[PDB]
Amino acid sequence: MDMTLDALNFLLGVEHLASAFYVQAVNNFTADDFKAAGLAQRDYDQFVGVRNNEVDHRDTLISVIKSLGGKPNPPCKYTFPVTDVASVLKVSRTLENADKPAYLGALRDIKSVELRTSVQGALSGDSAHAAFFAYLTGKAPAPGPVDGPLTQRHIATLAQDFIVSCPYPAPKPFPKLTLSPQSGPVGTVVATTCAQDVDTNGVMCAIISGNQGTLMQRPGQAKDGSGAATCTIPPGVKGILFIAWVRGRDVLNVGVDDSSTVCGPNYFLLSALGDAV
Amino acid sequence: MDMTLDALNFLLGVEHLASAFYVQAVNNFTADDFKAAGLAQRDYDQFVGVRNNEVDHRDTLISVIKSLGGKPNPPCKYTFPVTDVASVLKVSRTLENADKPAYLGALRDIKSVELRTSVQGALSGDSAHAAFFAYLTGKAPAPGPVDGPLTQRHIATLAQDFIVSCPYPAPKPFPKLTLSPQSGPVGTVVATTCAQDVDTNGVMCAIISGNQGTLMQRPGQAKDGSGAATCTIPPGVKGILFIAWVRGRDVLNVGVDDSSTVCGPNYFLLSALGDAV
Ligand SMILES: [Zn+2]
Ligand SMILES: [Zn+2]
Ligand SMILES: [Zn+2]
Ligand SMILES: [Zn+2]
């Protein structure tokens, strides 16, 4: 089955959300707001550039889908937890960090050499966006060598806090997995809690890394007696991690197969050379 | 017919060069040198991170090539003149800006879905490196929406000043195309001069953009009577540009077909929102 149109319309959903955020944020914040938050004119300028780039990413997907005889998805209805400039930068970082696995997963389904070149070229742009927002928020712009994929439903899981409703059947999220803390080095013990009362029998932690793939462990129990399941960041991983609860070892490569996913994933910002110290 | 090994060994040549540069740069410069140049500890830390990431990109290509039964290319012999931090940053930006079209071109030849996912994941990392070095040198980290490909020999042309010799038959560069100026906005008139004498019969300027593909124009002549050919940055382009001389108009998509290339390409840093003000 040629899944090209499916993949493109999924990416269009991703870019409708991102473009809506940046259009609204540029509308509501000025360079003076950025400067009051300690940023420079060129940071606001690049922020407008990100808006323009994401509008292009959305419009290009619309054009390509139409050229293939498809019907482009409309926007959904969104909500963004924006108050001050700092929150704008955090939301931006969150969106761009989820962009990359979305594009990487979708590229597995794009049949054409030429269309892969175009889509990869947009992934490259969103990776530059991610590096910019990392740097502005004190995170390493390039924390590791390899970014990895996630599935469409995994991406829906990352996006769900920003979606109020969709007017068409979009990819369904898994329940949200809350991580505490959501950043830190190898060896960090992460308390994990699920938004729904899922079956925890046989649950394992999947730590999804770009450089090592999926690494499995059986969860621990929180030392504070709260009953939360813990997952410990294992050695050898590099870059941004995604942590999920999965059914046993049913799946070796969770980034390309969500058939065992129970809760999550959510992102974890692994410490890296380049973080503010 | 399956060009996967050819593409991977070409990328290995690219990453032998980049990793060699960053290894020697870290040996020669310290965090105190970076701080004396106005940078912060986190910028030196990220620089070491880039070295580590590029070493990983190289080593991963070696492993994959062996796993496919191929013989990995050894390093070439390089020349990287060592002066100051400003030069380190400029060379770094130059390498990362060239390694993105290298990966995008090579990805056209990689047959396996799973190998494409891995290689795209490294391209994403190099795009983050490029964004970091752009920002530290006062250029927009994300100057446009789409990065485009170049051919193997185009990449060899960009790399040629760093290569002393190779101990195996490597892709032969085209002559260098010098561009004056090498940055500016739409409408900039660029004086173009080739390193070798070329028959000018039917030569066109090829402006190679990621968002609009290759745009062709007949060269102009410098107004100062200097007799140098000129190419004018056309409307609508976004992001980093590559400018080459090509012969005739039978090849339209120069980023994927170098069979009409005569001189260049060389890079041109198009002005963008995010450049230092
Ligand atoms: Zn995008
Ligand atoms: Zn994005
Ligand atoms: Zn690399
Ligand atoms: Zn690189």
Inside any domain, residue A168: no
Are B140 and A45 an interchain contact pair (Cβ–Cβ within 8 Å)?
Answer: yes
DSSP bridge pairs for A41: none
Cα–Cα distance, B176 to B130 (Å, whole number): 22
> Which residue, B142, B158, B182, sits at the end of a domain?
B142
Q: Are residues B11 and B132 both part of a single domain?
A: yes
User: B266 lies in a domain?
Assistant: yes
Residue-number span of the structural domain to which B65 is assigned: 4-142
**Residue B181 preceded by cis peptide, ω within 30:** yes
CB B41 within 8 A of CB B106: no
The verdict on B186 and B257 lying in the same domain is: yes
Q: Are residues B115 and B224 in the same domain?
A: no
Nearest to A272 among B49, B142, B277 (CB): B49
Angle separating helix axes B113-136 and B85-107, nearest 10 degrees: 160
User: Are A18 and A89 contained in the same domain?
Assistant: yes
A135 and chain B in contact, CB less than 8 A: yes
Tell me whether residue B149 is in a domain. Answer: no
| CATH code of the domain covering residue B242 | 2.60.40
Rounded Cα–Cα distance for residues A204 and A131 (Å)? 31
In a domain, B148, yes or no: no
Last residue of a domain, one of B142, B166, B201: B142
Distance CA A105, CA A100 (A): 9
The span from the CA of B146 to the CA of B166, in Å, is 32
- Smallest CA–CA distance, residue A87 to chain B, in Å, is 20
**CA of A119: which chain B residue's CA is closest?**
B146
DSSP state of A179: E
Give which of A175, A264, A180, A177 is closest to A226, Cα–Cα: A180
Give kind and range of the element (H or E) at residue B15: helix B4-28
What's the rounded Cα separation, in Å, for the pair B163 and B173?
A: 10
**Neighbouring C-beta atoms of residue B23, cutoff 10 Å:** 15
Chain A and chain B share a number of CB contacts under 8 A equal to 185
Which residue in B has a C-alpha nearest to residue A44's C-alpha?
A: B274
Report resolution in angstroms: 1.5
Residues B191 and B118 in one domain: no
End-to-end CA distance of chain A: 49
* B206 and B246 belong to one structural domain: yes
Residue B81 Cα distances to A73, B77, B154, B160, angstroms: 52, 13, 23, 14
Mark whether A124 and A212 lie in a shared domain.
no
Give the residue ranges of DSSP H helices in chain A: 4-28, 31-36, 41-67, 85-106, 113-136, 152-159
Do the Cβ atoms of A122 and B145 come within 8 Å?
Answer: yes
3-state secondary structure of A241: strand
For helices B152-159 and B4-28, angle between their N-to-C axes, nearest 10 degrees: 20
Query: How long is chain A?
Result: 277
Neighbours of B5 (CB within 10 A): 17
**CATH code of B126's domain:** 1.20.1260.10
User: Chain A: nearest CA to B41, how far in angstroms?
Assistant: 8
Ligand nearest to the CA of B99: 4
* CA proximity to A53, closest of A106, A127, A116: A127
The reply to whether A51 and A116 lie within a common domain is: yes
- The answer as to whether A114 is a domain residue is yes
Contacts for A59 with CB less than 8 Å, ≥ 6 apart: none
Identify the bridge partners of residue A245 per DSSP, sorted by sequence position: A205, A263
Is position B275 within any domain? no
Residues A129 and A186 in one domain: no
- Structural domains in chain B (count): 2
CATH number at residue A185: 2.60.40.1220
Q: Is B223 exposed, middle or buried (0-12, 13-18, 19+ CB in 10 A)?
A: exposed
3-state helix, strand, coil in chain A (%, to 5): 45, 20, 40
B243: part of which helix (H) or strand (E)? strand B241-247
CB contact under 8 A, B120 and A104: yes
- Residue A96, annotated as binding a ligand: yes
For A113-132, b/e burial (b = at least 16 CB within 10 A) is eebbbbbbbbbbbbbbbbbb
Do A126 and A236 fall into the same domain? no
Domain-terminating residue out of A90, A113, A136: A136
* Measured CA angle at A86 (ends A81, A92), to 5 deg: 65
Query: Are B40 and B113 within one domain?
Result: yes
Q: Which chain A residues are within 8 Å of B38, Cβ to Cβ?
A: none
